[PDB]
Design a protein around this ligand. Structure first.
Ligand SMILES: Oc1cccc(Oc2ccccc2)c1
Ligand SMILES: Oc1cccc(Oc2ccccc2)c1
Ligand SMILES: Oc1cccc(Oc2ccccc2)c1
Ligand SMILES: Oc1cccc(Oc2ccccc2)c1
Ligand SMILES: Oc1cccc(Oc2ccccc2)c1
Ligand SMILES: Oc1cccc(Oc2ccccc2)c1
Ligand SMILES: [Cl-]
Ligand SMILES: [Cl-]
Ligand SMILES: [Cl-]
Ligand SMILES: [Cl-]
Lengths: 201, 204, 201, 204
């Protein structure tokens, strides 16, 4: 694409995109063009507005584009072309990416006892409501736990809410604890955009 | 994919998909799986139901899957696996495609005079509310008008409603009428799915 | 999108797109922009050319854009902006859709006998090498056979060639022949972008 | 989808996916299914093999699925279902994501003088050949530089190679240096995956 300013916009929150080089108030020779999940290629939006788009994105008196509540389908490219009073043309190019922050990750099915030297299901962690999906990771006593390295295995599941499109992640951790290891370890789960079992030697 | 029955479902209308080989009423060992625009890969739906999916797709007492009002995001694949009382397993595989019928095509601008032997903007036709987009075609006196053949030019535009996702099509027709041709032709516009005629005077 | 000329281009064949209003030979103030399966949003192509794109799409001496062999990934939007010697700017907007014609449909597993009043597997039809997929339909004595109407059922399968992306369609027809019907019917299969069994009364 | 093991596979490199619970050598009752950028929904692959898929993915004597050189189109879901000699069925579910590591980021244009208290183009950084695209970040004296915070502005561009599909990123950094700040700062550019520093003189 072209050189653009990258914008991250939280779903459900308003977004104001500035049309650089536009006169401060009408009359303004400016045009907004957008290509998002809502459009077939480019859609042109004007200061006059009108129609269904007025519910989604409106040009403000200062020529900025206003979205009252951003959604997943507003991901895409937004462009303004304006002429000032001198006659100089100025372009504004935005690449808009949307996100949502999930609830705190929760442990839903933890083991109270592990046996050293064999594989053990440690627990299951769930994170609800992210966008984009993100990932869950496990930690042992503050250090990251790396799957497929050192008797650690992890299985993961992603589901989508059928109306909001937000993701739920579920992650299952299995470990083979090392002989003569910590008898009261602490496992934790974190989301990237406290399980304390007894270990039996 | 696998061999499936193709289903075309009108947006906004209910859809019932049969689970073949399931007992006529509970208890039933059956499971529905769907992969649509609503899902991340396969989603499993059970006779027990529950949760947000109950607003979208529910298993009925006879084991059929019911969607009260189909939407664009319900396009995809739907599968049932059931065991009868004997123990025979039966699979049902559906490929669901959704559609919407637009309003009647309308001419929104039209020429009242054409000049033979030069290019003329004849008119503009608009169709609102289709899914998938579909296409607009022009006709001259009942015969199809073919772009790039015989001095015919067409330009077309597709727009999407920002909330419903339904398509609006706009088509502009230009023609170079042939000398000594019909002085009162009839141009019409028609819509063809994706799975007031114009009567100007021509000046020789 | 904008008002454009719709172009259908056969896969594997060249495509020439005219830049309207460009001078007949260099020097020309023109620019091509394309958004296809090959691009991240718009890509700009110039008369100077250069780089990997020279293998895919090149601006010709008359300012037209030339693709030596169109592929599936060249589906999208193509635009030219040119200035003539007077200084008038002219835009050319193309919407390019690609296709491939499959081989003739073939019957691969036909019944020689049907029994009236019960369901019968009549046969299987296969079409290889289309793009986009297209559909197969069945006909009885020249009239279309409509699934789910009048004891007709059809199952369909679509597969994609793992390297070319072209589609293979397979279609299975079952019918319940009507009592006192034609004892030597003719079923045929057609592709949209001769099975002659004996029927036992 | 279902619970799966997530696999990250480097483009161009082989990939072996194990079919858990299969007999160690033929005869084996096992079946692989994959849904990737190469397939229309599920494709079934068998120990017998054959056809164009033999160039892309093959079942090995131990029942593992082998891809000699992974590509972007092999992203997707891979599943094995096998029966052992007892008759126990075991499923293997893999979610495969592909990646490519770009070349080292390079500064392609850079300022040799900045003026404190006004905006300055500092430089342009380029990274070629990543998949997925990834992002470029700027740093000042080892600390991350945050766009829109403290007179910092960044513009970025992503392009795709027309044949390989790998991404090239270009990032332009502008800063307004603070009065009485460091007169010999060090700006650097770094690449972060998607799953020669600049040392100008500053004029107060
Ligand atoms: O002449 C006009 C009058 C009104 C609006 C307008 O929109 C643009 C402004 C600047 C650049 C491009 C387009 C141009
Ligand atoms: O034993 C059960 C219990 C509940 C549901 C179920 O659903 C299936 C039926 C047949 C095949 C696969 C799945 C099977
Ligand atoms: O309008 C709706 C909305 C959701 C589900 C629904 O389907 C049932 C209704 C009653 C009982 C059983 C199924 C109908
Ligand atoms: O001034 C120039 C010089 C060279 C090429 C050029 O490319 C365009 C031509 C017309 C319109 C827009 C862009 C513009
Ligand atoms: O009987 C067979 C013969 C060949 C392959 C096969 O593959 C599966 C094994 C277990 C479960 C599902 C499929 C099963
Ligand atoms: O380079 C390749 C290309 C295709 C398949 C392949 O995998 C096998 C090779 C030999 C024997 C068995 C499997 C290796
Ligand atoms: Cl899901
Ligand atoms: Cl649109
Ligand atoms: Cl396939
Ligand atoms: Cl690009």
């Amino acid at each position: 694409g072209a050189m653009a300013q990258n914008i991250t916009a939280r779903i459900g929150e308003p977004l104001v995109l500035k049309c650089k080089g536009a006169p401060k108030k009408p009359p303004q020779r400016l045009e907004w063009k957008l290509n998002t999940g809502r459009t077939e290629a480019w859609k042109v939006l004007s200061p006059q507005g009108g129609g269904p788009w007025d519910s989604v994105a409106r040009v403000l008196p200062n020529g900025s584009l206003f979205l009252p509540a951003v959604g997943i389908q507003d991901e895409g490219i937004f462009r303004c072309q304006a002429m000032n009073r001198n006659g100089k043309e100025t372009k504004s190019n935005y690449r808009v990416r949307v996100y949502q922050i999930p609830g705190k990750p929760e442990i839903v099915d933890s083991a109270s006892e592990l046996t050293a030297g064999v594989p053990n299901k440690v627990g299951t962690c769930v994170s609800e409501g992210s966008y984009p999906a993100g990932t869950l990771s496990w930690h042992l006593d503050g250090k990251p736990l790396v799957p497929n390295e050192k008797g650690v295995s992890v299985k993961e599941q992603t589901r989508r809410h059928p109306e909001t499109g937000l993701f739920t992640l579920q992650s299952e951790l299995m470990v083979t604890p090392a002989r003569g290891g910590d008898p009261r370890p602490t496992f934790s789960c974190s989301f990237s955009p406290p399980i304390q079992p007894r270990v039996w030697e």
